[PDB]
Amino acid sequence: KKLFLVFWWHMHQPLYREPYTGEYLLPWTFFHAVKDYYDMPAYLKDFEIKLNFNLTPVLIDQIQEYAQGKAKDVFLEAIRKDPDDLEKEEVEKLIEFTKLNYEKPIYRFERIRELMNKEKLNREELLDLQTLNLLAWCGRTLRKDLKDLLNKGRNYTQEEKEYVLNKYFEIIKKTLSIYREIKEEGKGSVSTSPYYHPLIPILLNPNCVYETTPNVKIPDFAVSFREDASKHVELAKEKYFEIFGEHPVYMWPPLASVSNEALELYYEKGINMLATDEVILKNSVERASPYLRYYFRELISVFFRDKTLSDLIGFSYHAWNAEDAVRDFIGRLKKIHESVDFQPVVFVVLDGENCWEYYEENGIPFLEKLYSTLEKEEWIETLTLEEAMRKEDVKTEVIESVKAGTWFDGNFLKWIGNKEKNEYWKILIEAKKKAKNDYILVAEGSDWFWWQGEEKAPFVEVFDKLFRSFVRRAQE
Ligand SMILES: OC[C@H]1O[C@H](O[C@H]2[C@H](O)[C@@H](O)[C@@H](O[C@H]3[C@H](O)[C@@H](O)[C@@H](O[C@H]4[C@H](O)[C@@H](O)[C@@H](O[C@H]5[C@H](O)[C@@H](O)[C@@H](O)O[C@@H]5CO)O[C@@H]4CO)O[C@@H]3CO)O[C@@H]2CO)[C@H](O)[C@@H](O)[C@@H]1O
Numbered sequence: 001k002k003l004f005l006v007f008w009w010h011m012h013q014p015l016y017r018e019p020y021t022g023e024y025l026l027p028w029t030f031f032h033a034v035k036d037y038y039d040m041p042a043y044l045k046d047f048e049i050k051l052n053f054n055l056t057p058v059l060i061d062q063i064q065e066y067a068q069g070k071a072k073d074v075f076l077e078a079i080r081k082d083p084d085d086l087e088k089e090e091v092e093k094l095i096e097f098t099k100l101n102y103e104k105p106i107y108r109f110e111r112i113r114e115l116m117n118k119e120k121l122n123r124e125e126l127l128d129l130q131t132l133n134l135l136a137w138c139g140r141t142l143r144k145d146l147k148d149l150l151n152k153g154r155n156y157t158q159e160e161k162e163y164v165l166n167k168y169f170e171i172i173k174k175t176l177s178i179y180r181e182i183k184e185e186g187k188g189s190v191s192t193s194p195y196y197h198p199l200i201p202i203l204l205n206p207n208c209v210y211e212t213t214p215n216v217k218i219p220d221f222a223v224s225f226r227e228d229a230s231k232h233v234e235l236a237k238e239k240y241f242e243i244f245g246e247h248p249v250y251m252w253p254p255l256a257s258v259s260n261e262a263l264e265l266y267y268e269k270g271i272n273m274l275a276t277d278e279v280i281l282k283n284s285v286e287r288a289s290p291y292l293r294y295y296f297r298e299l300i301s302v303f304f305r306d307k308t309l310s311d312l313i314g315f316s317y318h319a320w321n322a323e324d325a326v327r328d329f330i331g332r333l334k335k336i337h338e339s340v341d342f343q344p345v346v347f348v349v350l351d352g353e354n355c356w357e358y359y360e361e362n363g364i365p366f367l368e369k370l371y372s373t374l375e376k377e378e379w380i381e382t383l384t385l386e387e388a389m390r391k392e393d394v395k396t397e398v399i400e401s402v403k404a405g406t407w408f409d410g411n412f413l414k415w416i417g418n419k420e421k422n423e424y425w426k427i428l429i430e431a432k433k434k435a436k437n438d439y440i441l442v443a444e445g446s447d448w449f450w451w452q453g454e455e456k457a458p459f460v461e462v463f464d465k466l467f468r469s470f471v472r473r474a475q476e
């Protein structure tokens with residue numbers, strides 16, 4: 001009797017490229033590419049297990065632009081310059097960026113502490129601030145090559161900074177290739193999502209928000225978004241075909257978000273399998289075991305992630321000693337294995353790039369130990385998505401209806417239903433009536449609604465500028 005374990009690491013960034021200037025207004029695609037997007041699948045070169053990945057098409061577009069030397073990244077321009085040439089505004093943004101990240105373990109450099117305690121920075125100090133901000137985001141692969149620079153800790157030169165930037169762009173240039181390689185080698189499946197990561201259930205039927213939050217107030221959706229929902233899926237299929245030369249048969253629904261109409265759309269577009277969240281299972285089905293392969297209306301296969309295991313990796317284990325977090329994780333899998341009489345399928349699904357910066361050494365001790373341990377367990381078999389879809393010796397059940405929601409409490413309240421978030425939907429509704437191009441699709445991405453109407457925070461006003469610029473461009 002085996003336990004089947006399926007990791008599905010989801011990778012996404014919203015479009016940071018302002019449409020009128022072409023400038024990338026935040027550097028997060030660059031920093032996660034150098035730190036996570038190459039290195040997460042690259043673990044498969046060193047560990048003989050299966051790991052799966054989701055890449056959103058909008059993320060792929062941006063990785064391609066950086067790899068081509070085309071991305072004008074305003075924050076990275078401030079890192080690259082000699083400090084004698086830094087604008088006052090650029091020094092302020094470098095300091096604000098450092099303060100935003102200062103408590104994360106990847107920023108654990110004594111020199112950063114000294115610099116943030118200084119009243120004014122000279123050129124030598126600013127070079128250290130620029131270079132240490134770069135080095136903080138070093139991925140696993142380059143942490144071996146750049147160990148001497150990482151350990152130097154201070155007194156960085158412009159030449160060393162440029163050397164680091166050159167190595168980082170080499171990683172970016174190899175990033176889409178490593179996803180293709182591990183797919184071609186059978187070491188993992190690669191999925192995609194509807195193109196700009198929207199909330200498909202809302203686009204298809206905004207009234208589905210009342211299924212979990214009947215008392216919510218939403219704007220007047222006086223225009224149809226149903227064709228846009230189809231377009232996000234169709235354009236993603238085309239991007240997937242451009243990258244991999246096949247059409248996809250599985251997709252990750254953004255924010256695990258499903259509804260009856262969304263599941264029907266995925267099936268109509270040729271998707272045979274997806275996963276979603278355990279809370280939606282509990283809201284929809286009586287006997288909510290997350291360890292079965294479900295068939296929605298006997299048409300599309302659906303797995304529900306184990307929320308507890310997914311949340312331990314995402315939120316708990318960054319603060320544990322790596323060996324003890326791995327022992328806890330394996331121990332919980334053993335309890336699942338002993339609790340059921342069939343072979344359970346355990347989906348662990350979460351963002352693949354956002355939790356590691358809170359772990360010691362960017363999660364490398366934890367993941368190396370976790371993967372090395374899984375390599376050895378006879379009663380655990382890690383699976384690709386294709387293998388999970390086809391596995392015959394697993395338990396199955398039919399589901400006839402789901403309650404629409406997301407992986408945030410099984411409802412939509414982080415994206416709609418308060419005054420500020422509703423204002424974004426009102427804007428989008430009005431612009432859709434006059435839309436002329438696919439920037440209306442960019443503006444449908446979930447990220448804009450997520451950041452809106454929350455407690456003020458550094459750089460989050462950039463998301464508002466991007467959203468509104470895409471809305472404006474969509475009508476021209
Ligand atoms: O205490 C306040 C607040 O602090 C922290 O929030 C701040 C972060 O610490 C800080 O890092 C910064 O967050 C950045 C983030 O680092 C950056 O990478 C970018 O985030 C991207 C994700 O990287 C990307 O994967 C994608 O995330 C999606 C994800 O794909 C999807 O599955 C799902 O989980 O929703 C996510 C959000 O849509 O996109 C986002 C960008 O949309 O940008 C972030 C904002 O600049 O700034 C944070 C706030 O200032 C804590 O993390 C937070 O819990 C605390 O409340």
Ligand SMILES: OC[C@H]1O[C@H](O[C@H]2[C@H](O)[C@@H](O)[C@@H](O[C@H]3[C@H](O)[C@@H](O)[C@@H](O[C@H]4[C@H](O)[C@@H](O)[C@@H](O)O[C@@H]4CO)O[C@@H]3CO)O[C@@H]2CO)[C@H](O)[C@@H](O)[C@@H]1O
Nearest residue numbers: 307310311314315316318350351354355356358407408409
């Ligand atoms: O408090 C600041 C914290 O920042 C870090 O939290 C990160 C996680 O590490 C990332 O993994 C990601 O979290 C995602 C998460 O991956 C995804 O599962 C989803 O989380 C759901 C959650 O499963 C569900 O139980 C419920 O609580 O709703 C959540 C929200 O929809 O979405 C998360 C948010 O994008 O990002 C968060 C914040 O970026 C760090 O781990 C924290 O400990 C740190 O203190």
